[PDB]
Amino acid sequence: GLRKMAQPSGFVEKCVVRVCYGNTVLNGLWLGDIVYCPRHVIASNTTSAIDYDHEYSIMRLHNFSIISGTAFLGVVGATMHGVTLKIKVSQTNMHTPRHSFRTLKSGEGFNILACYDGCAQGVFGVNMRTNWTIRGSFINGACGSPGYNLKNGEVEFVYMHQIELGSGSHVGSSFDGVMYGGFEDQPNLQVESANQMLTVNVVAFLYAAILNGCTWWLKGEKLFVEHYNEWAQANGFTAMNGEDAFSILAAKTGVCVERLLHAIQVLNNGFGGKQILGYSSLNDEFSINEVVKQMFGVN
Amino acid sequence: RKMAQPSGFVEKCVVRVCYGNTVLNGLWLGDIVYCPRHVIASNTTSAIDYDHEYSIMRLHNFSIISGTAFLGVVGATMHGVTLKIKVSQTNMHTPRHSFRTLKSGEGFNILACYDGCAQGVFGVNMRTNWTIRGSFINGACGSPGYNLKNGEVEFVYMHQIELGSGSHVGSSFDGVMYGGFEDQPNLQVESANQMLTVNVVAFLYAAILNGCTWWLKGEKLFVEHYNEWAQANGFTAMNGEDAFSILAAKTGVCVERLLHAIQVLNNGFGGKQILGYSSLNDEFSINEVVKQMFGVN
Ligand SMILES: COc1cccc2[nH]c(C(=O)N[C@@H](CC(C)C)C(=O)N[C@@H](C[C@@H]3CCNC3=O)C(=O)COP(=O)(O)O)cc12
Ligand SMILES: COc1cccc2[nH]c(C(=O)N[C@@H](CC(C)C)C(=O)N[C@@H](C[C@@H]3CCNC3=O)C(=O)COP(=O)(O)O)cc12
């Protein structure tokens, strides 16, 4: 079958801490001797526009409390970097994993460790959508929850949770302190752009259906990538690219991309009660990488 | 959003178990390694006489690796469809834990492992036909299923086989195969799956709490009439209306209006969608819905 999976969370869980500042609690990420967390933790009043330079100048280090498991950490300094704080603590996290920082591109998959009061509660896989929001599941207290990927024996930290938009979509920042999509960490309504279905993930899904033997939707007609891309601009799908990446899948099946792009056009009107790998409409959750790892064990 | 509970406490308990040329995953708790008994079978190709395989077992064929260390086997005994392998070494990362057998409908977490190393983690439900909708390939056997609850890890599932349908079957850690399936290379057909009605009701209450209510009408379907419709339409009977009384009280919507909606929505969504789903969804339990939206267990 095909299940949306998270990569294991163990390396990340040892780094999550609780960050208290005055009348606000949220989550931080403890790496080396730095704790990363959203800068709005220091905002005393969030019922009007937040002047972060003012909040920063009145900040006093003795109002911080940072808790790892049951241990308090000594706070030594704190600097502001975009929409994040970098808090210097007197102790090094001896469980700091091998890691780097990376900024997600449009459509890329990653993992969210949903944390509360400095303790992890759930983990799930998710895609950065073309409108720079994610479909998460967060309630109050989740700010500072980290997003990550495991690659080559290294943790890549990619997302720090920040805000929930009026529509229910979730916005975070990189650990550089740049908010995805340019959203503001301000208490006021902001509207995101319309979402686009990720065409390359729908193609990979349809290959998966072929390999699992679900072929009823498959015809023999081809739709040229260029003709599809004009249709996608008018129907809320991203353009097609990287057809060469689908070599692996096209070989094992003997079906070409341009036949599936035809199918994408047809199946956008509904599955008519039929179900493809157990879904009743097109799914853009799965990348080529995931299909290929889950079906064949090849990275 | 479907999620899993975090895996850190379980990851340190998974080991790589090799017997001869067969490799799979074991669970290291205390001084015992638990794993599927087919690790000692000579030919996973034809019928297996496990009493014979156990009698010719030779313990020096074992190799058990946790990270970089080798564990020393001192004995092994066979219980149901599992092996309990006693080693010299006690797992110093053993979490507070118990073993529990899942009932029909219950959700749990799977840590999919290969060669003794965790690769992914996802939530599942034990279906009424005693299979789960998983994702596994060769090498996944022994992958553990777990729940985190009341400051301890409950271990509930050991992965064992893929049915010809693609559905997946495991055992509890007392050696009892869920569904009574056999750990043999023969085609076995599970019974027909049923949609879990309590989970579908949980989902519609989730929809109401998020202001998704186009489908909601005023008509009421009494539980006994629904259950008659259910037995003939591949749905489970309505039960445990107790936790739903709480949701009914908060939303003002009685369960009987949702049972009616199920009967109607079963014939398709008419184009529209519910929480982004294009058809009835029974993947979420009432606990998951309450935990995710209100933060309470
Ligand atoms: C009137 O203004 C609005 C209008 C319409 C929509 C709006 N949306 C936000 C927003 O997103 N506000 C951030 C803080 C900003 C103002 C600095 C926030 O609330 N984040 C949560 C996680 C959120 C909470 C529920 N689900 C989550 O993902 C934290 O965890 C961190 O802070 P808190 O734990 O709540 O104290 C303000 C707002
Ligand atoms: C040929 O007759 C059949 C007919 C129809 C359906 C059938 N199904 C099986 C089966 O499932 N067989 C068990 C081995 C038992 C019988 C001893 C198995 O293959 N288990 C996998 C997990 C599986 C592997 C693929 N996806 C998974 O979930 C392990 O992990 C251990 O095996 P490996 O050492 O890793 O290959 C045999 C069979």
Swiss-Prot record, chain A:
Record note on what altering residue 133 to D does: Complete loss of 3CL-PRO activity
Superkingdom of the source species: Viruses
Effect of residue 63 to G: No loss of 3CL-PRO activity
Domain Peptidase C30: 1-299
Phenotype when changing residue 40 to G/S/T/Y: Complete loss of 3CL-PRO activity
Resulting phenotype, residue 63 to A/D/E/Q: Increase of 3CL-PRO activity
Protein name: 3C-like proteinase
Residues of the full protein shown: 2967 to 3265 of 6758
